[PDB]
Amino acid sequence: QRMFEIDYSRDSFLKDGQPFRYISGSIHYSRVPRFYWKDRLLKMKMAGLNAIQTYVPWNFHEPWPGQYQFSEDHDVEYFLRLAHELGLLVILRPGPYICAEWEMGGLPAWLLEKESILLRSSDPDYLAAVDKWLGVLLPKMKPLLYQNGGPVITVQVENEYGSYFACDFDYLRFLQKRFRHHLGDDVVLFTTDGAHKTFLKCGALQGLYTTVDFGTGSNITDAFLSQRKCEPKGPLINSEFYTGWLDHWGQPHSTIKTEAVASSLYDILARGASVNLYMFIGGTNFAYWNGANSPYAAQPTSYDYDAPLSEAGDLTEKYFALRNIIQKFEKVPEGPIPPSTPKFAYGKVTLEKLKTVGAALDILCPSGPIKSLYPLTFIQVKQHYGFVLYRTTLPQDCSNPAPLSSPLNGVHDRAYVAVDGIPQGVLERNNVITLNITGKAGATLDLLVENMGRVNYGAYINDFKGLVSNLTLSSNILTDWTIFPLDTEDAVRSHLGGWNYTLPAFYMGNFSIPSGIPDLPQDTFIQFPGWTKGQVWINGFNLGRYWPARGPQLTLFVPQHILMTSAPNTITVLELEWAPCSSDDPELCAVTFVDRPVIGSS
Amino acid sequence: QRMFEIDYSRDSFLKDGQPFRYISGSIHYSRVPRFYWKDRLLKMKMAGLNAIQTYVPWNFHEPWPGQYQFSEDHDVEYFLRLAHELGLLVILRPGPYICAEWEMGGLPAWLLEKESILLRSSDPDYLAAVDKWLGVLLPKMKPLLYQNGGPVITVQVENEYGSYFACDFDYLRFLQKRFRHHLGDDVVLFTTDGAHKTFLKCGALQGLYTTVDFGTGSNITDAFLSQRKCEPKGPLINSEFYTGWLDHWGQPHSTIKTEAVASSLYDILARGASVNLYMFIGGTNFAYWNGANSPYAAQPTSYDYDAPLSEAGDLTEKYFALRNIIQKFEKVPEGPIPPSTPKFAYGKVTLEKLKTVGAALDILCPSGPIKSLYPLTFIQVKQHYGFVLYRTTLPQDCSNPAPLSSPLNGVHDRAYVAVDGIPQGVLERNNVITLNITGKAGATLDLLVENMGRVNYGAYINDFKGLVSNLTLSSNILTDWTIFPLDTEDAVRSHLGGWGHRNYTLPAFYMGNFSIPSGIPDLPQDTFIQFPGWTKGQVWINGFNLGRYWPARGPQLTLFVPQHILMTSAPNTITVLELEWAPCSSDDPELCAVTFVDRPVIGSS
Ligand SMILES: *[C@@H]1O[C@H](CO)[C@@H](O)[C@H](O)[C@H]1NC(C)=O
Ligand SMILES: *[C@@H]1O[C@H](CO)[C@@H](O)[C@H](O)[C@H]1NC(C)=O
Ligand SMILES: *[C@@H]1O[C@H](CO)[C@@H](O)[C@H](O)[C@H]1NC(C)=O
Ligand SMILES: *[C@@H]1O[C@H](CO)[C@@H](O)[C@H](O)[C@H]1NC(C)=O
Ligand SMILES: *[C@@H]1O[C@H](CO)[C@@H](O)[C@H](O)[C@H]1NC(C)=O
Ligand SMILES: *[C@@H]1O[C@H](CO)[C@@H](O)[C@H](O)[C@H]1NC(C)=O
Ligand SMILES: *[C@@H]1O[C@H](CO)[C@@H](O)[C@H](O)[C@H]1NC(C)=O
Ligand SMILES: *[C@@H]1O[C@H](CO)[C@@H](O)[C@H](O)[C@H]1NC(C)=O
Ligand SMILES: OC[C@H]1O[C@@H](O)[C@H](O)[C@@H](O)[C@H]1O
Ligand SMILES: OC[C@H]1O[C@@H](O)[C@H](O)[C@@H](O)[C@H]1O
Ligand SMILES: [Cl-]
Numbered sequence A: 001q002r003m004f005e006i007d008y009s010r011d012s013f014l015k016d017g018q019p020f021r022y023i024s025g026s027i028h029y030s031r032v033p034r035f036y037w038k039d040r041l042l043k044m045k046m047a048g049l050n051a052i053q054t055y056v057p058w059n060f061h062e063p064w065p066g067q068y069q070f071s072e073d074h075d076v077e078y079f080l081r082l083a084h085e086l087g088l089l090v091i092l093r094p095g096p097y098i099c100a101e102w103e104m105g106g107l108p109a110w111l112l113e114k115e116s117i118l119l120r121s122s123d124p125d126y127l128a129a130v131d132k133w134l135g136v137l138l139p140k141m142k143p144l145l146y147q148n149g150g151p152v153i154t155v156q157v158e159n160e161y162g163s164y165f166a167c168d169f170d171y172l173r174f175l176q177k178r179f180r181h182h183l184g185d186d187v188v189l190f191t192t193d194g195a196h197k198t199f200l201k202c203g204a205l206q207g208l209y210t211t212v213d214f215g216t217g218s219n220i221t222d223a224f225l226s227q228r229k230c231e232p233k234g235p236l237i238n239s240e241f242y243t244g245w246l247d248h249w250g251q252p253h254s255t256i257k258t259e260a261v262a263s264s265l266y267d268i269l270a271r272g273a274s275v276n277l278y279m280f281i282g283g284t285n286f287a288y289w290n291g292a293n294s295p296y297a298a299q300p301t302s303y304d305y306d307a308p309l310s311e312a313g314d315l316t317e318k319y320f321a322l323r324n325i326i327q328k329f330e331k332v333p334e335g336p337i338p339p340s341t342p343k344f345a346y347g348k349v350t351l352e353k354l355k356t357v358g359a360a361l362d363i364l365c366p367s368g369p370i371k372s373l374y375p376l377t378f379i380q381v382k383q384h385y386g387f388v389l390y391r392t393t394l395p396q397d398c399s400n401p402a403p404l405s406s407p408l409n410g411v412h413d414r415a416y417v418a419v420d421g422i423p424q425g426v427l428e429r430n431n432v433i434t435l436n437i438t439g440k441a442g443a444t445l446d447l448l449v450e451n452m453g454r455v456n457y458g459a460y461i462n463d464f465k466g467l468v469s470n471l472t473l474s475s476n477i478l479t480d481w482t483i484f485p486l487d488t489e490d491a492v493r494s495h496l497g498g499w500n501y502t503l504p505a506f507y508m509g510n511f512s513i514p515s516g517i518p519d520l521p522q523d524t525f526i527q528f529p530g531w532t533k534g535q536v537w538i539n540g541f542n543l544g545r546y547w548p549a550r551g552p553q554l555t556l557f558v559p560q561h562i563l564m565t566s567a568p569n570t571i572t573v574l575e576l577e578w579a580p581c582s583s584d585d586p587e588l589c590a591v592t593f594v595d596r597p598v599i600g601s602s
Numbered sequence B: 001q002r003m004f005e006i007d008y009s010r011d012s013f014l015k016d017g018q019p020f021r022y023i024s025g026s027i028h029y030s031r032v033p034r035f036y037w038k039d040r041l042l043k044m045k046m047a048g049l050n051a052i053q054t055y056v057p058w059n060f061h062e063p064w065p066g067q068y069q070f071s072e073d074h075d076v077e078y079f080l081r082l083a084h085e086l087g088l089l090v091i092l093r094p095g096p097y098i099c100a101e102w103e104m105g106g107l108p109a110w111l112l113e114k115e116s117i118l119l120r121s122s123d124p125d126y127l128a129a130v131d132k133w134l135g136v137l138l139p140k141m142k143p144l145l146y147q148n149g150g151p152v153i154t155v156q157v158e159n160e161y162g163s164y165f166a167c168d169f170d171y172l173r174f175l176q177k178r179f180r181h182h183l184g185d186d187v188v189l190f191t192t193d194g195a196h197k198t199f200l201k202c203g204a205l206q207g208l209y210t211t212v213d214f215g216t217g218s219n220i221t222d223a224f225l226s227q228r229k230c231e232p233k234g235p236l237i238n239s240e241f242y243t244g245w246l247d248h249w250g251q252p253h254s255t256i257k258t259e260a261v262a263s264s265l266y267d268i269l270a271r272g273a274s275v276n277l278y279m280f281i282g283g284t285n286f287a288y289w290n291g292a293n294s295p296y297a298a299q300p301t302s303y304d305y306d307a308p309l310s311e312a313g314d315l316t317e318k319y320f321a322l323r324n325i326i327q328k329f330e331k332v333p334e335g336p337i338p339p340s341t342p343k344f345a346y347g348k349v350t351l352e353k354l355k356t357v358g359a360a361l362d363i364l365c366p367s368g369p370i371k372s373l374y375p376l377t378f379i380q381v382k383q384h385y386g387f388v389l390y391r392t393t394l395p396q397d398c399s400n401p402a403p404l405s406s407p408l409n410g411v412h413d414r415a416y417v418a419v420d421g422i423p424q425g426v427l428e429r430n431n432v433i434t435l436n437i438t439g440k441a442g443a444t445l446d447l448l449v450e451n452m453g454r455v456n457y458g459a460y461i462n463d464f465k466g467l468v469s470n471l472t473l474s475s476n477i478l479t480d481w482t483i484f485p486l487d488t489e490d491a492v493r494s495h496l497g498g499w500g501h502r503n504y505t506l507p508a509f510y511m512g513n514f515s516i517p518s519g520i521p522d523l524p525q526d527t528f529i530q531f532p533g534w535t536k537g538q539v540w541i542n543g544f545n546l547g548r549y550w551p552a553r554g555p556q557l558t559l560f561v562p563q564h565i566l567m568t569s570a571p572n573t574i575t576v577l578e579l580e581w582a583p584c585s586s587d588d589p590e591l592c593a594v595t596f597v598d599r600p601v602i603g604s605s
């Protein structure tokens, strides 16, 4: 019955034998709570989009080999059926690498158990893992294909492979074969690359439809000319037309002017091109899901992106401007649009110190530490995200400051250093590779090391994390390590089993919200004035990382569905550098909930 | 064990042996959907109030003798428990007359089945009905008394009886005896009257603690001196400190400046007086619950009152100002205040004419009409609220216009007139008692008569409604009437029978639907419905009577729509009964429409 094809004669798609052009927006289901999926998708439909595009992050669904997450917030099949329900078609981008400002570009960290693995290549072990994953993911996607009665009209193979150094065409051919095996011969498969011959050279493949991406700064004629060199016939397609841009901690918040996005969008549509707006809603990197760029710079918790729908799904002036552009080409749905959610300022909530990390090792590491002559990486100790404690003893007296150093810049990515429970400061990847320390001979030297997010783009995506090379004290290699993987997520859920720098520590407090009030709880934004850098949970849900010391993001988005009215709400903060809690004023040791986000602080 | 008493020695209340004074606000549960009771009550607590005050409208709970309504939106017992659960005390004002800009001051219209009844007196038939009501209501209130473990700390007897002409002290003694019988000998019983000896003369009674009321334009010293003449000892009390004032259709919206309310409130509290703010939230007169004053002027649907909480429960600058003054005397609760609800503009919804009233008679009046030589009142035909159709035949040719009159001014309160399906205009209490009509001899003369609300204050609360006296045509009395009481609420809920039973236009029902998406956390939201191009009528959404609209008079243009009556996926049905002129004749379907907006307009020019 149902057909979706490239017709090479009208330089067009044909949907059920009819000319069809898609106007799509990116929404990542892994970046929006399922609680809000229908809200965001309906707002997208009301803007006049006839499709949405999404990434399937492999690491979000296969945390360990043969252990799968496809329920609740991880229910990609439900997300796709919901789009279909709403009358939206779907452009699926299952990777296996997705880039996406996401931890290791979507690639599971357990791949790095083979230390020499060449990711995104014909490396047999990488291929074998990909094949197993595709064997689980793609039969799920097959019934969701358009010709089988679902919304999925096209499927991207890999992601900007032309930008990667390997240029392994056999790898692309493998993916083509395997996608065809599972999905059949009719599904439109495609690739996306930068709009230049240099990018297309290694990214394009025979039998995969070549598309390009570009934002508001690109010459649109030249960009499509570059696509046309690869595909003389067929639809013009811009698969990632940038509505904004990504951020890094410590760098000014990225914005793109509404007038520029509207002007380029109109230009692209008027050409008869299919287009996807990246991002339409950006949402949030909750927990440890953010990625990084090289030279090492992590992206923040917010993935607001300056997108047409704000992080919390708000209707922006950019949203209405783009909807007005779409309306010049297509009739958009009638009726009022679902509103921006109400936001509530719950106000100040005092916290109290629970325990330092150092005092909580029984709860954080209930299996006991691993001993090693030299330091081991996160992967070697079977921990992918969060924090690992490295412990040794001082081999000499350090009454005078002694250089603690990682000569090969092997602190990936940041270490909070203490000696006999006295904080010494911080080692930082690419920035501070030496720190002067003091303490007695035999004193306990602790390094709490944070994985700040695995690099998601470029050659250095094989990003192990931890102490990846030796530390020296006064030029001498430090040996005899006691390494504690830290079960932070379990420990926070159990209130740590109790069911200038400060020592890394957990602080906790409670706030209640009244029941029987129709419009509470509401969404809110948590702010950390006086704090420095850490992690935050509300009711055990890891909301991500805060860093008001660096910016530009000051507030974190808190979705209302994790807040309750039946029992008090708990807030737990892991502060890594300096807590405003040593003062004799308990009111200082506190967080604040505000009703407007601050993501563009200077 | 718990105690609440007047300490006469020390001019105070005692609560469990401790000095106490109350800072209360009025909330009428009959004017707030139950969906929102906890919301309003919590905002009230967060303002620093330690008590709320409320009226029990008798007619709201006993629509016919022995038929009672105490469930859902009528659940007084629950409202009082909810207040108690929030840590609020209650000043209960059970009447039996409450005034309150409410239909007939709370008294049931069926009292008027005795035409000569003297309301609010020792009239035996009045007392018998009062006694039966008290014997149902008061035993429900007994466990809610403070000394039995509930919130109720004081109870008002009657309501400003000193303003009424009768001065029947037997009546007051009878209430006192009956309240004591049911509630016991400890409950503080009190009266409230205007702060002047001319009011207190007939309102105050031995054994009932005399309190006064006054607003921002009163001298506080003089007002409390007037109280002290009646109660030399005991707490100073202002039982109705006015934060705003009532409205009437066609008059500008009443406001009172925030600074005036704040300053007077400060001065009252500084005297150590207990005080209740009337109203703290006013809410809404849904359906036909509004009252009227004399000379006849009905209060509108909105009871916003310019109160510190707006009709939809919003936090206003007045709210925060009053909270700030209360904080100067007492500690106010910690924590953020529940917010003003979100409002959503659902936009324009087109309607279309379903049926005229005349075409829907069989569904509105399924038991048939009552025939009578001369017209009968609402009360006589056993209808209390809404609309009754009076029908006769023209006895003379009226090819030339002939005067239809109510010589004794007895159209109570408005009649929409038609002859053989052609609208002739409107007869109006006081204003227009004659209308020229045309039609052939034997033509059907219809008058659709609306009860615009029974007067709630003054001598004239015995307000029957309907054609209360004869009609004349060219000076000759019109005889032989066929009178149709109209079950509009039943008929609207069944879509004029379409869902089964499991310049002027003819009065008619206009319907339209709109949908709200499901699975959206923040929809449905509260909204406000506006009627541009419409004239006068009644409005329902999903069978819930939201009240009366009258953009032709104002000041209320919009009507408050609470979100809980709206539904997702399934279409919401709006029914408009337009009485005078609908914007629905022209070939432009777009004009026959209502509009939902996100801001109220109750104070338009
Ligand atoms: C884009 O490049 C083309 C030539 O390929 C040139 O003609 C045109 O002016 C350029 N457009 C813009 C907006 O710069
Ligand atoms: C540490 O101390 C030594 C001697 O005071 C000094 O030369 C060196 O610059 C210091 N290094 C750091 C990294 O602070
Ligand atoms: C540390 O140093 C030892 C001895 O020089 C060497 O064998 C080892 O490879 C180093 N280990 C790491 C993780 O750098
Ligand atoms: C906070 O709430 C938790 C559970 O939500 C409870 O077990 C604990 O006793 C409370 N602690 C404080 C300090 O309020
Ligand atoms: C109110 O009346 C008293 C006399 O009872 C007088 O002293 C006072 O000046 C008056 N207050 C005002 C504000 O006029
Ligand atoms: C009724 O008609 C007469 C003419 O017969 C006219 O004098 C009178 O003013 C009219 N009355 C009304 C109420 O229009
Ligand atoms: C109508 O007129 C008759 C005859 O004068 C009179 O007896 C009757 O009481 C009047 N009825 C009303 C309802 O005014
Ligand atoms: C309004 O909706 C109800 C239920 O679906 C239906 O009975 C009625 O016919 C509807 N009217 C229109 C015009 O859709
Ligand atoms: O936000 C920048 C974007 O850049 C693209 O080149 C890439 O395909 C996306 O996944 C994303 O990283
Ligand atoms: O809003 C004006 C008020 O006037 C008072 O005199 C009366 O007791 C109240 O019930 C109410 O009518
Ligand atoms: Cl995407």
Ligand SMILES: [Cl-]
Pocket: B026, B027, B053, B054, B055, B093
């Ligand atoms: Cl009251």
